[PDB]
Amino acid sequence: YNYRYRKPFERDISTEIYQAGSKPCNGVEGFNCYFPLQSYGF
Amino acid sequence: CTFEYVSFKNLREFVFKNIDGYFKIYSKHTPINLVRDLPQGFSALEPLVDLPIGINITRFQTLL
């Protein structure tokens, strides 16, 4: 589970949550508020 | 944090632009004999550096 993913040649390491709906998530995980990096599971 | 690099009379002019994650700098240094405003005249800035920063910019600030 070490390897992770979410303009040209951009890089974006910001750790802020998916505000996946109208909720201001304030870093709290829940419905419409999800951690921004997935991982592979090799 | 992935990148690091090293290298009124004095009017110094610069251009800063970001394209495809490169940061491009052009410059020109000249004497002048004026105070309130940029002198009415012409010369071209020439390229200094072309740095592979890969980073987003929308705001900037100057250090005195």
Ligand SMILES: *[C@@H]1O[C@H](CO)[C@@H](O[C@@H]2O[C@H](CO)[C@@H](O)[C@H](O)[C@H]2NC(C)=O)[C@H](O)[C@H]1NC(C)=O
């Ligand atoms: C570069 O930074 C700007 C912010 O300074 C980003 O623009 C925002 O993008 C989000 C995407 O969801 C929008 O909700 C905001 O309305 C945008 N704000 C402004 C001021 O335009 C931009 O997307 C960033 N680009 C990259 C590739 O990181």
